[PDB]
Design a protein around this motif. Structure first.
Motif, PDB file in Angstrom:
ATOM      1  N   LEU A  28      74.178  50.161  66.999  1.00  0.00           N
ATOM      2  CA  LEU A  28      73.784  49.726  67.761  1.00  0.00           C
ATOM      3  C   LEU A  28      73.260  48.325  67.860  1.00  0.00           C
ATOM      4  CD1 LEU A  28      73.213  50.198  71.100  1.00  0.00           C
ATOM      5  CD2 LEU A  28      70.930  51.454  70.209  1.00  0.00           C
ATOM      6  N   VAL A  31      75.656  45.527  67.957  1.00  0.00           N
ATOM      7  CA  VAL A  31      76.194  45.236  69.204  1.00  0.00           C
ATOM      8  C   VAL A  31      75.348  44.134  69.772  1.00  0.00           C
ATOM      9  CG1 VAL A  31      77.098  45.827  71.512  1.00  0.00           C
ATOM     10  CG2 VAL A  31      77.508  47.280  69.386  1.00  0.00           C
ATOM     11  N   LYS A  39      72.257  30.827  72.202  1.00  0.00           N
ATOM     12  CA  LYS A  39      73.678  30.720  71.852  1.00  0.00           C
ATOM     13  C   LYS A  39      74.385  31.886  71.416  1.00  0.00           C
ATOM     14  CE  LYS A  39      72.938  26.188  71.811  1.00  0.00           C
ATOM     15  NZ  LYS A  39      73.568  25.346  72.804  1.00  0.00           N
ATOM     16  N   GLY A  40      73.603  33.134  72.118  1.00  0.00           N
ATOM     17  CA  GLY A  40      74.285  34.370  71.712  1.00  0.00           C
ATOM     18  C   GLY A  40      75.584  34.634  72.370  1.00  0.00           C
ATOM     19  N   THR A  41      76.403  35.584  72.061  1.00  0.00           N
ATOM     20  CA  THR A  41      77.649  35.991  72.689  1.00  0.00           C
ATOM     21  C   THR A  41      77.511  36.333  73.915  1.00  0.00           C
ATOM     22  OG1 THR A  41      77.660  37.926  71.586  1.00  0.00           O
ATOM     23  CG2 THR A  41      78.789  36.229  70.342  1.00  0.00           C
ATOM     24  N   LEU A  42      78.332  36.218  74.747  1.00  0.00           N
ATOM     25  CA  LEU A  42      78.777  36.792  76.024  1.00  0.00           C
ATOM     26  C   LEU A  42      79.692  37.922  76.189  1.00  0.00           C
ATOM     27  CD1 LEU A  42      77.993  36.504  79.246  1.00  0.00           C
ATOM     28  CD2 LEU A  42      79.956  34.784  79.457  1.00  0.00           C
ATOM     29  N   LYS A  43      79.232  39.301  76.718  1.00  0.00           N
ATOM     30  CA  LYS A  43      80.191  40.329  76.667  1.00  0.00           C
ATOM     31  C   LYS A  43      80.389  40.744  78.133  1.00  0.00           C
ATOM     32  CE  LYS A  43      78.436  42.490  72.658  1.00  0.00           C
ATOM     33  NZ  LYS A  43      77.100  41.672  72.144  1.00  0.00           N
ATOM     34  N   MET A  44      81.628  41.210  78.292  1.00  0.00           N
ATOM     35  CA  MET A  44      82.298  41.516  79.800  1.00  0.00           C
ATOM     36  C   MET A  44      82.369  43.302  79.710  1.00  0.00           C
ATOM     37  SD  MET A  44      85.319  40.198  82.184  1.00  0.00           S
ATOM     38  CE  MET A  44      84.386  38.788  82.772  1.00  0.00           C
ATOM     39  N   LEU A  45      82.057  43.864  80.595  1.00  0.00           N
ATOM     40  CA  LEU A  45      82.275  44.963  80.750  1.00  0.00           C
ATOM     41  C   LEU A  45      83.203  45.450  81.894  1.00  0.00           C
ATOM     42  CD1 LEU A  45      78.706  46.823  80.418  1.00  0.00           C
ATOM     43  CD2 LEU A  45      80.654  46.556  78.532  1.00  0.00           C
ATOM     44  N   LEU A  54      79.636  41.092  83.940  1.00  0.00           N
ATOM     45  CA  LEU A  54      79.635  39.975  82.903  1.00  0.00           C
ATOM     46  C   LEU A  54      78.173  39.809  82.841  1.00  0.00           C
ATOM     47  CD1 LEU A  54      80.918  38.001  81.026  1.00  0.00           C
ATOM     48  CD2 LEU A  54      81.406  36.518  82.993  1.00  0.00           C
ATOM     49  N   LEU A  61      74.653  47.051  79.192  1.00  0.00           N
ATOM     50  CA  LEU A  61      75.634  47.202  78.318  1.00  0.00           C
ATOM     51  C   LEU A  61      75.068  48.944  77.860  1.00  0.00           C
ATOM     52  CD1 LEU A  61      75.637  44.237  75.721  1.00  0.00           C
ATOM     53  CD2 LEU A  61      77.317  44.901  77.282  1.00  0.00           C
ATOM     54  N   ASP A 162      73.805  28.592  80.571  1.00  0.00           N
ATOM     55  CA  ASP A 162      73.774  27.120  79.936  1.00  0.00           C
ATOM     56  C   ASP A 162      73.044  26.309  80.416  1.00  0.00           C
ATOM     57  OD1 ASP A 162      75.296  26.931  82.080  1.00  0.00           O
ATOM     58  OD2 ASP A 162      76.970  25.831  81.189  1.00  0.00           O
ATOM     59  N   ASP A 164      73.459  24.017  82.587  1.00  0.00           N
ATOM     60  CA  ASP A 164      74.128  23.649  84.047  1.00  0.00           C
ATOM     61  C   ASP A 164      73.394  24.617  85.079  1.00  0.00           C
ATOM     62  OD1 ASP A 164      75.541  21.713  82.952  1.00  0.00           O
ATOM     63  OD2 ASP A 164      77.556  22.968  82.864  1.00  0.00           O
ATOM     64  N   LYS A 204      76.744  27.027  91.122  1.00  0.00           N
ATOM     65  CA  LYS A 204      76.086  25.871  90.903  1.00  0.00           C
ATOM     66  C   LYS A 204      75.425  25.269  92.166  1.00  0.00           C
ATOM     67  CE  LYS A 204      78.071  24.488  86.272  1.00  0.00           C
ATOM     68  NZ  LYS A 204      78.906  23.531  85.684  1.00  0.00           N
ATOM     69  N   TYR A 385      81.307  39.341  89.646  1.00  0.00           N
ATOM     70  CA  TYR A 385      80.635  39.646  88.446  1.00  0.00           C
ATOM     71  C   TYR A 385      79.640  38.281  88.505  1.00  0.00           C
ATOM     72  CZ  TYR A 385      84.196  36.236  86.550  1.00  0.00           C
ATOM     73  OH  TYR A 385      85.018  35.308  86.300  1.00  0.00           O
TER      74      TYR A 385
END
Lengths: 538, 548, 75
Positions: A28, A31, A39-45, A54, A61, A162, A164, A204, A385
């Motif tokens: 766990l 994940v 800078k961590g990853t982006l996950k989509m469900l 997203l 999650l 980010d 932006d 934006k 999303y």
């Protein structure tokens, strides 16, 4: 001995159960290991129904994806409850619980009893609270510094999105919490700020609005769209078909009575409409330039909409229940239930009222208030999303900024709090602590588990977590003898350390206090559980 | 050795949950998954584009080359493709134009990103490369704009706007389809020049009625709305002229009934004898006040009883049924009438004006003619569309809506802001971004230079679908842009574009004579949505799916 | 104990009364013990003797999950 009690049952104990809590919490944490950090990853469900979620929030999650392992269920309920009260710390508690189980698992294999290990966790955690008083920095709200609220709000924004979307949403959240602070000092998070999902332009282009916005608009064309000065009348009574009380009905003797009894339905409707006309007779002064609007909590009979059209009165029906409580804060008036007693004092005031029709739905915008006591945030997004990604990013930033105004103190981020506890617990004399003998080991397992979060931040940047913390410990050695008090952070851009106070990285006070207290109770109960079985009547 | 550990400790999630990350070539498979549906929309681009057939689960067939419409009926599996699917739907709703460009441009940004990822560029540096290049792209679009629409309505000027938009959707004959749409636009415009009023336009004002049979050349423009209806009592050509006075009632015509327990109460036979003649005098008294006002037509919104239809035939009053809501709402905008729920005498100021009402056979059924005349102009005109097949009638209806949506682009901004068409917009941006990539030091120039390479798909698609070699034609087009700008002003080389078939070898001189242009307001949102669509896919390091 | 109409809350607000959501039967017995109040079903029979008194403080604190209403005893 369970096979004799039940014909079919499954159970795992001692070394079989010891691998349950350690390994399940390891999968766990892996994940959410890549989740932590800006800078961590982006996950989509994507579920079977076709919906798309997203977000970088670890709470989504856990709620969307089911978990068969009972060990993570205790962690999921702990990580979800952390985001409920403090609005932050979902992925933090998971990294604390999962790692503390593994750091203490190495000594369990050495023959150390789990109880004396968990006893050292409480001794080491109580020292984090005593150190928390000297670690926190006091901030006075009498200065009303806007720059201080900008740097704190960017902590949660840079993590989810980010730079932006951060530069756009930074003044929006700051302007939202600016009206929350009052001489009463009471901070109410739900009524002051809302999240309204609407698809327009690009994400934006999200802008801030100083007054309440509604999802409803005028049904009749002749209703004025733009009204300079409008007096908002709060009406919680609905004019429409009623329950009629078992439907007794009318009985007419002749055809002339059939239409004569049909006019009785409009008798009760027009009875309450005459009170509104009498109230309009007081405000009739400067009628072309000014205006009168009506906002109803429940649907309005279309038969009565033509009455408000001739008087140029904007009617709004099927409004939300929470929106009725904010009409006193925005406009400044009062709520009116019965139309028998009406006064000009309860009428609100608005400097600009306009409606923007996009597609089939029509929205009503209110702004330019003399002394508005509440505001709104209009969320715009390109996709379904995208509305949820901004919703989770702004809402998590609300509790972070709101908790700053609650207390007088603020906690610096960038791993400065976790590194400070490592040198504090390892260099502390055990004679002052209540832990002795083998209980000294349990404290070291808690201090080493806190250094993974600053290393987890580096794993997402690509740099070696071991080499980047070598310069952090070397800086704190000469800082004590140089008569200089400075907190050392972690800068992931250049792979070197930094100062959270100068860079502007700050963390809420209630998040870290409840996270360590919450994560300690979860990991302690798992180490003290030597057996896992499943039994029940189904 | 016989059986694998099969991913131990995988019981943390359900067996239907799958984890896909940018590692192990899955981000390349996601880009490769785009190319499956990308090539579907490549052959549909341009005036030579090829329409596609999509059969849904109910059996309905929609033949269109529009990328936004085709992706609606298709069932999408891969999650990142839904990012591209929902990106094309927003472009169709907002600007109603440039739907195929968002589908193609967002797909090419991922294709050129495959080489960017292979070279080691991180996902963070790739996003910053497109964001910095897009801001420079939007600034160059305003510098390259030429011409303006100026006056709202003109016979010639409306041929430089709607006509190039409808040329890609069901090309066919040029002047035939352009005249039908351009005529209905002039009727809904308030005009009122020199008054200083704020112009207004509605995209739902123009309605397209699909009628099978006949030919496209037999189509016409009707100032009024056309429905399929059968008059109840009688049909009337209304040759007595002097126009008419018409009233609209959203409520049905019948004796008012109590909403609770409507029941006939008769105590004695004396009240029963007068009950039959009593209801006849009620409708007579109500319909007499309407007939005294000179109302020859009444629009009903629900079912009308037979007792009410009897007295309407006595005075020669037409009866119209307008079910639901939106159908009745646009009827009053034609005649300028205000509905009222009561059955009493309407206000003379709220009565509409319709000169003639005719009923003739068009597609085999009786249709009612609301058409207006020169004076007493009306709004929300309809276009009768005649065709042999119903499949062509569906996309032409959407093709007309593309021209109607182009009229909306003449209101909100300061003007039309025509851009060079035939792909000349995306080609000029290639040489400008290439110079912009060199002016920026650092490693971010790799994503900026490749961002301009993705614009090469527009000239290659128009050349490939035209039956021409992209290797011979495309490099010959850069010869006009390789000579930069001379020592003298007035350079017309910016009008060079891609030609379909014919003699090839570039051609069509300058597109200024061709009159085909593009909208600036369309290209602004077409690049922003397509960039964010490809950025979203590249910003997702790990993808998780359920049930499959 | 049961639901309340939006019409009755106005005349109670004019006189200073406060309205609350419907309450379960289990909580009605604990409230009567703290303030010494007596449960009165019939409105016409309501008297000053059955009115609860000696309540220390009434406040509402904000928590993200749900609202919370506090009733303090004067001990």
């Amino acid at each position: 001995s369970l096979q004799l009690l039940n014909p079919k049952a499954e159970s795992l104990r001692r070394d079989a159960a010891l691998k349950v809590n350690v390994t399940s919490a390891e999968g766990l944490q892996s994940v959410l290991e890549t989740n932590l950090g800006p800078k961590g990853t982006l996950k989509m469900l994507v579920d079977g129904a076709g919906n798309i979620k997203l977000t970088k929030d670890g709470k989504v999650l856990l709620t969307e994806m089911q978990i068969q392992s009972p060990t993570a269920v205790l962690i999921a309920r702990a990580a979800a409850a952390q985001d409920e009260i403090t609005g932050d710390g979902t992925t933090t508690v998971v990294c604390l619980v999962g790692e503390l189980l593994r750091q203490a698992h190495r000594f369990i294999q050495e023959g150390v009893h789990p109880r004396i290990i968990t006893d050292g966790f409480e001794i080491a955690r109580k020292e984090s609270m005593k150190f928390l008083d000297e670690f926190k920095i006091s901030k006075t709200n009498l200065s009303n510094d806007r720059e201080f609220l900008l740097q704190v709000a960017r902590s949660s924004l840079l993590t989810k999105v980010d730079a932006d979307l951060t530069e756009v949403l930074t003044p929006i959240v700051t302007d939202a919490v600016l009206s929350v602070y009052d001489a009463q000092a009471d901070n109410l998070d739900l009524h002051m700020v809302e999240i309204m999902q609407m698809q327009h332009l690009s994400p934006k282009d999200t802008t801030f609005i100083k007054g309440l916005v509604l999802d409803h608009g005028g049904r009749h064309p002749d209703m004025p769209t733009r009204v300079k000065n409008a007096y908002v009348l709060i009406l919680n009574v609905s004019l429409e078909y009623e329950k009629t009380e078992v439907n007794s009905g009318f009985f007419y003797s002749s055809a002339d009575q059939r239409d004569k009894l049909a006019a009785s339905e409009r008798k009760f409707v027009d009875a309450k409409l005459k009170k509104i006309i009498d109230l309009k007779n007081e405000v009739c002064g400067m009628d072309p330039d000014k205006g009168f609007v009506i906002i109803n909590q429940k649907g309005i009979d279309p038969m009565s909409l033509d009455v408000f059209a001739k008087h140029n009165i904007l009617a709004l029906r099927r409004a939300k229940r929470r929106n009725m409580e904010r009409l006193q804060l925005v406009t400044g008036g009062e709520a009116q239930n019965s139309v028998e007693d009406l006064s000009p004092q309860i009428l609100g005031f608005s400097g600009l009222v306009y409606q923007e029709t996009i597609g089939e739905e029509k929205f009503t915008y209110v702004t330019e208030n003399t002394d508005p006591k509440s505001c709104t945030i209009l969320i715009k997004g390109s996709t379904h999303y995208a509305l949820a990604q901004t919703k989770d990013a702004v809402r998590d930033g609300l509790r972070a900024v709101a908790n700053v105004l609650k207390d007088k103190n603020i906690i610096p981020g960038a791993g400065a709090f976790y590194i400070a506890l490592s040198r504090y617990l390892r260099s502390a004399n055990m004679n002052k602590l209540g832990a002795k003998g083998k209980t000294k080991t349990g404290i070291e397992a808690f201090a080493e588990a806190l250094l993974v979060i600053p290393k987890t931040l580096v794993k997402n940047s690509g740099f070696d977590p071991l080499d980047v913390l070598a310069m952090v410990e070397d800086e704190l050695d000469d800082a004590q003898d140089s008569d200089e008090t400075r907190y050392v952070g972690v800068d992931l851009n250049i792979g070197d350390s930094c100062d959270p106070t100068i860079e502007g990285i700050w963390d809420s006070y209630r998040v870290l206090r409840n996270a360590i207290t919450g994560a300690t109770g979860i990991a302690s109960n798992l180490l003290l559980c030597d057996e896992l079985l499943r039994a029940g009547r189904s | 050795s016989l059986r694998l550990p099969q991913n131990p400790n995988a019981g943390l999630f359900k067996q239907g949950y799958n984890s896909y990350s940018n590692a192990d070539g899955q981000i390349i498979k996601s880009i490769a998954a785009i190319r499956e549906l990308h090539q579907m929309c490549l052959t549909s681009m341009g005036p030579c584009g090829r329409n596609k057939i999509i059969v849904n689960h109910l059996g309905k067939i929609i033949i269109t080359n529009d990328a936004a419409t085709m992706l609606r009926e298709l069932d999408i599996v891969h999650p990142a493709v839904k990012v591209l699917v929902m990106a094309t739907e927003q472009q169709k709703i907002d600007m109603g134009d440039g739907t195929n460009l968002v589908m193609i441009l967002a797909g090419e940004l991922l294709n050129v990103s495959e080489k960017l990822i292979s070279m080691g560029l991180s996902a963070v540096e790739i996003i910053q490369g497109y964001n910095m290049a897009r801001k420079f792209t939007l600034k160059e679009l305003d510098e390259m704009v030429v011409g303006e629409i100026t006056d709202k309505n003109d016979k010639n000027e409306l041929l430089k706007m709607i006509k190039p938009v409808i040329s890609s959707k069901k090309y066919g004959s040029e002047d035939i389809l352009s005249e039908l749409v351009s005529e209905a636009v002039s009727h809904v415009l308030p005009v009122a020049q020199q008054a200083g009023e704020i112009p207004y336009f509605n995209v739902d004002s123009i309605r397209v009625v699909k009628i099978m049979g006949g030919s496209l050349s037999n189509s016409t423009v009707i100032k009024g709305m056309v429905f399929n209806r059968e008059p109840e009592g009688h049909v009337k050509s209304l040759s007595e002229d002097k126009k008419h006075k018409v009233a609209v009632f959203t409520c049905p015509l019948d004796i008012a009934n109590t909403e609770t327990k409507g029941t006939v109460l008769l105590h004695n036979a004396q009240e029963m004898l007068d009950f039959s003649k009593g209801e006849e005098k009620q409708i007579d008294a109500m319909m007499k006040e309407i007939a005294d006002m000179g109302v020859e037509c009444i629009v009903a919104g629900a079912g009308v009883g037979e007792l009410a239809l009897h007295y309407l035939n006595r005075y020669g009053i037409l009866v119209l049924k307008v079910p639901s809501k939106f159908e009745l709402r646009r009827l009053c905008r034609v005649c300028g009438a205000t509905p009222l729920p009561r059955l009493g005498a309407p206000t003379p100021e709220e009565l509409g004006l319709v000169e003639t009402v005719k009923t003739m056979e068009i597609g085999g059924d009786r249709v009612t003619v609301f058409k207006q005349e020169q004076g007493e102009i009306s709004r929300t005109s309809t276009i009768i569309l005649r065709g042999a097949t119903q499949n062509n009638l569906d996309d032409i209806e959407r093709a007309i809506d593309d021209g109607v949506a182009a009229v909306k682009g003449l209101m909100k901004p300061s003007g039309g802001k025509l851009l060079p068409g035939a792909g000349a917009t995306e080609i000029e941006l290639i040489s400008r971004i290439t110079k912009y990539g060199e002016r920026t030091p650092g490693l971010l120039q790799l994503a900026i230079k490749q961002f301009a390479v993705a614009f090469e798909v527009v000239p290659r698609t128009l050349a490939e679908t035209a039956g021409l070699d992209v290797n011979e034609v495309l490099p010959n087009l850069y010869a006009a842009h390789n000579v930069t700008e001379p020592g003298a002003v007035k350079t017309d080389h910016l009008y060079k574009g891609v030609d379909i078939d014919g003699e090839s070898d570039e051609g069509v001189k300058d597109i200024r004579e061709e009159n085909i242009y593009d909208m600036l307001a369309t290209k602004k949102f077409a690049i922003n949505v397509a960039t964010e669509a490809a950025t979203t896919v590249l910003s997702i390091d790990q993808i998780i799916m359920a049930k499959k | 104990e049961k639901g309340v109409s939006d019409l009755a809350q106005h005349y109670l607000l004019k006189g200073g009364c406060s309205v609350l959501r419907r309450v379960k039967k289990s909580d009605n017995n604990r409230i009567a013990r703290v303030t010494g109040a007596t449960i009165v079903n019939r409105v016409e029979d309501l008297k000053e003797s059955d009115v609860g008194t000696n309540c220390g403080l009434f406040k509402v604190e904000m928590i993200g999950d749900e609202y919370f209403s506090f009733l303090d005893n004067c001990k």
